[PDB]
Amino acid sequence: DADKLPHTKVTLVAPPQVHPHEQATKSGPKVVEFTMTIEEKKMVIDDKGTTLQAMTFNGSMPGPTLVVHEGDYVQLTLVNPATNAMPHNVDFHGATGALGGAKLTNVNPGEQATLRFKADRSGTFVYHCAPEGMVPWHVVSGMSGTLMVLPRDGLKDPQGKPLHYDRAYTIGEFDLYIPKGPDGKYKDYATLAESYGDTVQVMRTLTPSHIVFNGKVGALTGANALTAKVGETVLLIHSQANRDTRPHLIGGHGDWVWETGKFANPPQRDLETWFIRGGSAGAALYTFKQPGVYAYLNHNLIEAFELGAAGHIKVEGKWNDDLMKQIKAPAPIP
Amino acid sequence: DADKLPHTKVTLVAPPQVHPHEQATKSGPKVVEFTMTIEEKKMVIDDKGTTLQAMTFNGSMPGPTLVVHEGDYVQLTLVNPATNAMPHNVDFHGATGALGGAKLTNVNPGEQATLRFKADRSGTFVYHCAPEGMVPWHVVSGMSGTLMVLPRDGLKDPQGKPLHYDRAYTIGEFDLYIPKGPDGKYKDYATLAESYGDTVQVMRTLTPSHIVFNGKVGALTGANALTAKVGETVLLIHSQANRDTRPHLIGGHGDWVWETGKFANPPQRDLETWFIRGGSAGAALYTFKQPGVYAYLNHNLIEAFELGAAGHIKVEGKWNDDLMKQIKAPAPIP
Amino acid sequence: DADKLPHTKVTLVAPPQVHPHEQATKSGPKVVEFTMTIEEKKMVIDDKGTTLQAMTFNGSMPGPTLVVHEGDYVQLTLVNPATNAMPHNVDFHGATGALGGAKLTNVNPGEQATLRFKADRSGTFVYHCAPEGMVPWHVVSGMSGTLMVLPRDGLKDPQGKPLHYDRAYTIGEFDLYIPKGPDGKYKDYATLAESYGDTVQVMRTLTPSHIVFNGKVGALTGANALTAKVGETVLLIHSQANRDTRPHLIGGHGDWVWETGKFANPPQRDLETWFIRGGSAGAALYTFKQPGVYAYLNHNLIEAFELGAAGHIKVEGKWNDDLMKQIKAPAPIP
Ligand SMILES: [Cu+2]
Ligand SMILES: [Cu+2]
Ligand SMILES: [Cu+2]
Ligand SMILES: [Cu+2]
Ligand SMILES: [Cu+2]
Ligand SMILES: [Cu+2]
Ligand SMILES: [Zn+2]
Ligand SMILES: [Zn+2]
Ligand SMILES: [Zn+2]
């Protein structure tokens, strides 16, 4: 009975960070309370000024990551301010029943709702908006994120030995379908409603115009690169609510990877590239061994370099000549 | 020696049902006899009346599912009536040699053939037509289905504990390539032969016009929704003979999933979305816990909602507030 | 300390062969030395005479396979002759640091470099060229191959029992993006530089014009078919540096498959079709049981038969009626 449990209240943080949480814990089950507020807004998604008539949880693409433990109950207040134009809801893949909770959270602008469900399965799970008749549009316009349900005793390798991360990052990858006009330039829409018909037409081609991490080409580069140090273990959460992707860390590996994202299954080790099925979130651990700037990208290299599915990780620490050494620098052929 | 074994004769049933069979069995190996008759026919594949010049095993897309046990011999009589226009054959991925049996089953209209092979590997396996020089066309036009080879002692979890289903369903997903004329409307062809050249051109683009479960948009919805009750375990067999797909049960999970479809491998648990590689069949078990109407769909949501890769499962039983509860219904923001 | 180890020198061989090597070995770690020389060249890629302004390691698509053992150090001299027009480098997914070694191997025409890295993880790993600002183009133009790092004690099944192959083949699958002119014919370019802008435009559509094994439609067919005998175990290495593919052996299986390509993970058995993620190499073992001509192909059958992703394996030996028997040849319907 969930009514007998202590409630806790979690404050969410914006991607690529994930809110403070314990991995292995001595705590018994709780009702963990969250709130998210929907924001529709026009966003600039590339270097040339293309806009998207976007829809978001909490103002960001992806929505923030929610973290609980197996056996906890997730209790979400979903808010849809009167300043929004469309109805919304939420479908938690981590949840059982009522189309993931969509049927119980249909909120018009000016309304809110509170859903509770038992997080009875460990893993990273997609959540997304799913209003009847407009599901793909709300999803591709930005309305998805990840629920991470940790096992109560933390992550385990295939032999049941403990695994941990020192730092977690959350990456949402968005296949975007931005329409063009007769002049071949991308269209700019005054309102969200006006983008709809043209966007569906692009969607039906199955060819994205852009594929971006965290809402924009270069979102996770420069000042906004992810960070780590040699000897630190990072968890990279990767969600793709609509389309397949193949994450890869250049100069690195997936040390332990749950590509289907479900922690009761043994992870695979030493991966070069893994696979996130459209409509899922996966998770990879990597312990840095070399300093420098790494790229974390979709290894369809066109989707990465041409369409935008690539970020950077800047890693501090000491170079290791045993792992890699330039024996002879570039020089004239003898 | 297969010649020493008892023969049995199985009557096939139309998808989404699967013919009666045992899971774990005390029976020794048999020669299990089946017959299928090819039918070419024009089919209506969507709500607006688009037609496909279709080719089928037994009149349905997919063909019926054949069920045997590991160590059985499958003995198929393939019939190609004189009323058909094209030659056909059959390639069983569950079989060893002779291009899956295609080289031994080439049947012109007015002909038939009988193939036997040993079902020596457990799993769900694609079978499809594969005539020399026209393989993709016959496959994308509807000529595929599943052979399920059960382990003699039934299904097992990763720890070797017994698993079972109470009810099995078979879903074939078909990427269709319907041509358009200068007016942008889909073409309607008088004969199967006349659809050929235009269809190959669409195929080479790799963009399906439609992606359907079981031959038609909405095939598994309304009166034709799949059914179950709370507490019942369903096996969902999903075949895709030509293209990748990513099955998902909305409000549910894959409790135990063999996404590559081969039962001697441990299944994965708690999946949100799994992956069926083009040219394969996979299998998922789910035990219902909540009543209501679920969607079972390809989680490329464009492929599902726009192109047709989605069905429904209507589930009877009692709602469970512990698993999910609407705490506060939609109501004005305070 | 790698400086204390014996060096060995390996002579590479052209695909589809793989250079002689030991599987399980009593040898301790070595510095294994290789050399590759880059060659840009126009290649004919199909039956109708289409050309590609290609870029290669060692003159072939894919580059040759490099084989070492876990704990060895790979020491590559990369040569870029003055007869080439572009700068190049190499990114080993099998390596740790410096963007796979790309940052340490930037070679202009007339230059060379020597990189060493520790092959500390078992598996088949992609290597590819990756010059800053032109990564996808160099990769899709042909600059990838496989590093195989064998476990020192050879391959193992999920129970830790020994596995082996008698013969290894390496297949690189290349999604090509050949431009067309106003007349709808493929363009022929005088130089590599002139192909660039048009090619990027085709690439951004994500639709390949051709998808080929080993540089050309039909590369592994006729005189060039792969070969084996009944009772022989073959290792099929399959690399795809940019795009997903789904290998299948028609009339056969993947007996033991590492589809993510990393040997410290248990392989799956009995696969009909497996999955190579773009930006990875995978490996399958199969022991032939029937003689004849098999097809080894991408099981998107359009990508195989229409676009070129298919080869042949000619297998010698004695037919086995127990595995498969034509009971009644094609004959009039009674
Ligand atoms: Cu919404
Ligand atoms: Cu969903
Ligand atoms: Cu046919
Ligand atoms: Cu096949
Ligand atoms: Cu290059
Ligand atoms: Cu790479
Ligand atoms: Zn740590
Ligand atoms: Zn049951
Ligand atoms: Zn052998």
Side-chain angles (χ1 to χ4, degrees), chain A residues 1-3 5-184 186-313 315-334, chain B residues 1-3 5-184 186-313 315-334, chain C residues 1-3 5-184 186-313 315-334:
Chain A
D1 171 48
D3 299 321
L5 301 174
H7 286 43
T8 195
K9 298 189 176 171
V10 171
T11 299
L12 293 161
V13 307
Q17 316 301 329
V18 177
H19 77 249
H21 59 280
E22 291 188 282
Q23 289 158 63
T25 182
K26 293 178 182 181
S27 177
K30 309 210 160 155
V31 173
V32 185
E33 289 172 22
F34 303 86
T35 299
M36 289 194 297
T37 304
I38 301 145
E39 185 192 9
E40 300 160 12
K41 54 175 166 179
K42 191 140 123 191
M43 299 174 91
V44 176
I45 58 155
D46 70 13
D47 299 322
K48 67 189 170 289
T50 309
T51 64
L52 168 70
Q53 278 288 352
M55 308 181 219
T56 69
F57 294 103
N58 268 17
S60 60
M61 294 167 64
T65 295
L66 285 60
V67 188
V68 297
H69 290 82
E70 186 178 348
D72 289 344
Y73 295 74
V74 171
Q75 189 167 293
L76 177 71
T77 300
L78 183 62
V79 180
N80 187 10
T83 49
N84 286 325
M86 303 293 162
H88 306 281
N89 63 28
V90 67
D91 163 359
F92 280 91
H93 289 192
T96 301
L99 299 173
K103 286 229 137 18
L104 299 179
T105 52
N106 288 302
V107 283
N108 293 310
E111 296 180 332
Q112 72 184 58
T114 305
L115 177 75
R116 182 189 79 200
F117 67 87
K118 189 174 193 171
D120 64 350
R121 300 161 186 262
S122 76
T124 50
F125 294 82
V126 160
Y127 68 81
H128 60 83
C129 185
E132 199 67 52
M134 37 186 189
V135 173
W137 182 45
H138 283 239
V139 177
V140 302
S141 297
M143 305 200 71
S144 66
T146 306
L147 171 79
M148 184 160 67
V149 187
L150 291 159
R152 199 156 292 282
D153 195 36
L155 301 177
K156 305 297 187 64
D157 85 0
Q159 282 65 61
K161 295 198 198 161
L163 295 175
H164 77 280
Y165 47 97
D166 301 299
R167 149 112 30 83
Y169 288 120
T170 190
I171 300 91
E173 176 176 340
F174 292 87
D175 46 314
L176 302 180
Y177 299 91
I178 314 296
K180 294 174 167 170
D183 63 6
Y186 291 111
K187 290 211 205 171
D188 183 334
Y189 299 98
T191 66
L192 176 62
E194 292 169 280
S195 71
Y196 173 71
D198 284 347
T199 297
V200 173
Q201 292 309 299
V202 188
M203 288 167 63
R204 299 178 55 88
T205 69
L206 309 174
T207 306
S209 55
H210 301 260
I211 308 171
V212 296
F213 289 172
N214 291 25
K216 189 176 197 260
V217 172
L220 302 177
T221 67
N224 294 312
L226 309 183
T227 55
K229 321 217 151 145
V230 172
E232 196 177 12
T233 306
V234 293
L235 172 81
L236 304 172
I237 298 167
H238 201 112
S239 61
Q240 223 304 9
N242 190 64
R243 192 179 174 275
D244 308 326
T245 180
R246 54 213 61 73
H248 170 84
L249 181 60
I250 306 195
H253 291 91
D255 280 343
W256 293 110
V257 178
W258 292 265
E259 78 171 24
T260 50
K262 310 298 167 279
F263 299 139
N265 301 291
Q268 280 203 134
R269 56 170 291 146
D270 306 318
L271 304 196
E272 66 191 309
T273 301
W274 42 108
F275 195 63
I276 304 307
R277 296 136 187 73
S280 71
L285 295 166
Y286 186 64
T287 299
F288 286 98
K289 303 220 268 270
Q290 298 279 38
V293 182
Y294 293 69
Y296 175 68
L297 53 64
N298 168 344
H299 214 293
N300 182 311
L301 299 172
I302 304 165
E303 292 186 2
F305 290 98
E306 288 296 321
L307 309 185
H312 295 151
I313 313 186
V315 179
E316 307 302 319
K318 178 200 221 162
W319 185 262
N320 182 336
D321 269 343
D322 181 57
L323 287 161
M324 182 178 289
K325 190 173 173 182
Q326 191 184 45
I327 301 304
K328 295 187 176 174
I333 299 161
Chain B
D1 171 48
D3 299 321
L5 301 174
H7 286 43
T8 195
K9 298 189 176 171
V10 171
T11 299
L12 293 161
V13 307
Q17 316 301 329
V18 177
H19 77 249
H21 59 280
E22 291 188 282
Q23 289 158 63
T25 182
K26 293 178 182 181
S27 177
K30 309 210 160 155
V31 173
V32 185
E33 289 172 22
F34 303 86
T35 299
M36 289 194 297
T37 304
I38 301 145
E39 185 192 9
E40 300 160 12
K41 54 175 166 179
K42 191 140 123 191
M43 299 174 91
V44 176
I45 58 155
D46 70 13
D47 299 322
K48 67 189 170 289
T50 309
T51 64
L52 168 70
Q53 278 288 352
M55 308 181 219
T56 69
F57 294 104
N58 268 17
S60 60
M61 294 167 64
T65 295
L66 285 60
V67 188
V68 297
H69 290 82
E70 186 178 348
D72 289 344
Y73 295 74
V74 171
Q75 189 167 293
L76 177 71
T77 300
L78 183 62
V79 180
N80 187 10
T83 49
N84 286 325
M86 303 293 162
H88 306 281
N89 63 28
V90 67
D91 163 358
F92 280 91
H93 289 192
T96 301
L99 299 173
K103 286 229 137 18
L104 299 179
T105 52
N106 288 302
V107 283
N108 293 310
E111 296 180 332
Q112 72 184 58
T114 305
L115 177 75
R116 182 189 79 200
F117 67 87
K118 189 174 193 171
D120 64 350
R121 300 161 186 262
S122 76
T124 50
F125 294 82
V126 160
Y127 68 81
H128 60 83
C129 185
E132 199 67 52
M134 37 186 189
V135 173
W137 182 45
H138 283 239
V139 177
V140 302
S141 297
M143 305 200 71
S144 66
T146 306
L147 171 79
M148 184 160 67
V149 187
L150 291 159
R152 199 156 292 282
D153 195 36
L155 301 177
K156 305 297 187 64
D157 85 0
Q159 282 65 61
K161 295 198 198 161
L163 295 175
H164 77 280
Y165 47 97
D166 301 299
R167 149 112 30 83
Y169 288 120
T170 190
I171 300 91
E173 176 176 340
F174 292 87
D175 46 314
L176 302 180
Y177 299 91
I178 314 296
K180 294 174 167 170
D183 63 6
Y186 291 111
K187 290 211 205 171
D188 183 334
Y189 299 98
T191 66
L192 176 62
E194 292 169 280
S195 71
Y196 173 71
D198 284 347
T199 297
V200 173
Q201 292 309 299
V202 188
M203 288 167 63
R204 299 178 55 88
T205 69
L206 309 174
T207 306
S209 55
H210 301 260
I211 308 171
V212 296
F213 289 172
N214 291 25
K216 189 176 197 260
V217 172
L220 302 177
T221 67
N224 294 312
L226 309 183
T227 55
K229 321 217 151 145
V230 172
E232 196 177 12
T233 306
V234 293
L235 172 81
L236 304 172
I237 298 167
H238 201 112
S239 61
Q240 223 304 9
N242 190 64
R243 192 179 174 275
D244 308 326
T245 180
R246 54 213 61 73
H248 170 84
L249 181 60
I250 306 195
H253 291 91
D255 280 343
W256 293 110
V257 178
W258 292 265
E259 78 171 24
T260 50
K262 310 298 167 279
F263 299 139
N265 301 291
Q268 280 203 134
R269 56 170 291 146
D270 306 318
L271 304 196
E272 66 191 309
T273 301
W274 42 108
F275 195 63
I276 304 307
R277 296 136 187 73
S280 71
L285 295 166
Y286 186 64
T287 299
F288 286 98
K289 303 220 268 270
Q290 298 279 38
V293 182
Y294 293 69
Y296 175 68
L297 53 64
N298 168 344
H299 214 293
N300 182 311
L301 299 172
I302 304 165
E303 292 186 2
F305 290 98
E306 288 296 321
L307 309 185
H312 295 151
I313 313 186
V315 179
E316 307 302 319
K318 178 200 221 162
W319 185 262
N320 182 336
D321 269 343
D322 181 57
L323 287 161
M324 182 178 289
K325 190 173 173 182
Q326 191 184 45
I327 301 304
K328 295 187 176 174
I333 299 161
Chain C
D1 171 48
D3 299 321
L5 301 174
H7 286 43
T8 195
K9 298 189 176 171
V10 171
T11 299
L12 293 161
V13 307
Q17 316 301 329
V18 177
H19 77 249
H21 59 280
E22 291 188 282
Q23 289 158 63
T25 182
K26 293 178 182 181
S27 177
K30 309 210 160 155
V31 173
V32 185
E33 289 172 22
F34 303 86
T35 299
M36 289 194 297
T37 304
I38 301 145
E39 185 192 9
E40 300 160 12
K41 54 175 166 179
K42 191 140 123 191
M43 299 174 91
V44 176
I45 58 155
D46 70 13
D47 299 322
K48 67 189 170 289
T50 309
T51 64
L52 168 70
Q53 278 288 352
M55 308 181 219
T56 69
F57 294 103
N58 268 17
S60 60
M61 294 167 64
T65 295
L66 285 60
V67 188
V68 297
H69 290 82
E70 186 178 348
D72 289 344
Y73 295 74
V74 171
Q75 189 167 293
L76 177 71
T77 300
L78 183 62
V79 180
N80 187 10
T83 49
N84 286 325
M86 303 293 162
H88 306 281
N89 63 28
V90 67
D91 163 359
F92 280 91
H93 289 192
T96 301
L99 299 173
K103 286 229 137 18
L104 299 179
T105 52
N106 288 302
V107 283
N108 293 310
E111 296 180 332
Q112 72 184 58
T114 305
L115 177 75
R116 182 189 79 200
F117 67 87
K118 189 174 193 171
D120 64 350
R121 300 161 186 262
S122 76
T124 50
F125 294 82
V126 160
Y127 68 81
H128 60 83
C129 185
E132 199 67 52
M134 37 186 189
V135 173
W137 182 45
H138 283 239
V139 177
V140 302
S141 297
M143 305 200 71
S144 66
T146 306
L147 171 79
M148 184 160 67
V149 187
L150 291 159
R152 199 156 292 282
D153 195 36
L155 301 177
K156 305 297 187 64
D157 85 0
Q159 282 65 61
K161 295 198 198 161
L163 295 175
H164 77 280
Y165 47 97
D166 301 299
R167 149 112 30 83
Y169 288 120
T170 190
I171 300 91
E173 176 176 340
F174 292 87
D175 46 314
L176 302 180
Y177 299 91
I178 314 296
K180 294 174 167 170
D183 63 6
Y186 291 111
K187 290 211 205 171
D188 183 334
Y189 299 98
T191 66
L192 176 62
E194 292 169 280
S195 71
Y196 173 71
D198 284 347
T199 297
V200 173
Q201 292 309 299
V202 188
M203 288 167 63
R204 299 178 55 88
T205 69
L206 309 174
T207 306
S209 55
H210 301 260
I211 308 171
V212 296
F213 289 172
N214 291 25
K216 189 176 197 260
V217 172
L220 302 177
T221 67
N224 294 312
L226 309 183
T227 55
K229 321 217 151 145
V230 172
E232 196 177 12
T233 306
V234 293
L235 172 81
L236 304 172
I237 298 167
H238 201 112
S239 61
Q240 223 304 9
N242 190 64
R243 192 179 174 275
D244 308 326
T245 180
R246 54 213 61 73
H248 170 84
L249 181 60
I250 306 195
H253 291 91
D255 280 343
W256 293 110
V257 178
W258 292 265
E259 78 171 24
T260 50
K262 310 298 167 279
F263 299 139
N265 301 291
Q268 280 203 134
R269 56 170 291 146
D270 306 318
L271 304 196
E272 66 191 309
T273 301
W274 42 108
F275 195 63
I276 304 307
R277 296 136 187 73
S280 71
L285 295 166
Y286 186 64
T287 299
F288 286 98
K289 303 220 268 270
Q290 298 279 38
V293 182
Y294 293 69
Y296 175 68
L297 53 64
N298 168 344
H299 214 293
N300 182 311
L301 299 172
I302 304 165
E303 292 186 2
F305 290 98
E306 288 296 321
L307 309 185
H312 295 151
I313 313 186
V315 179
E316 307 302 319
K318 178 200 221 162
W319 185 262
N320 182 336
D321 269 343
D322 181 57
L323 287 161
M324 182 178 289
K325 190 173 173 182
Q326 191 184 45
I327 301 304
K328 295 187 176 174
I333 299 161

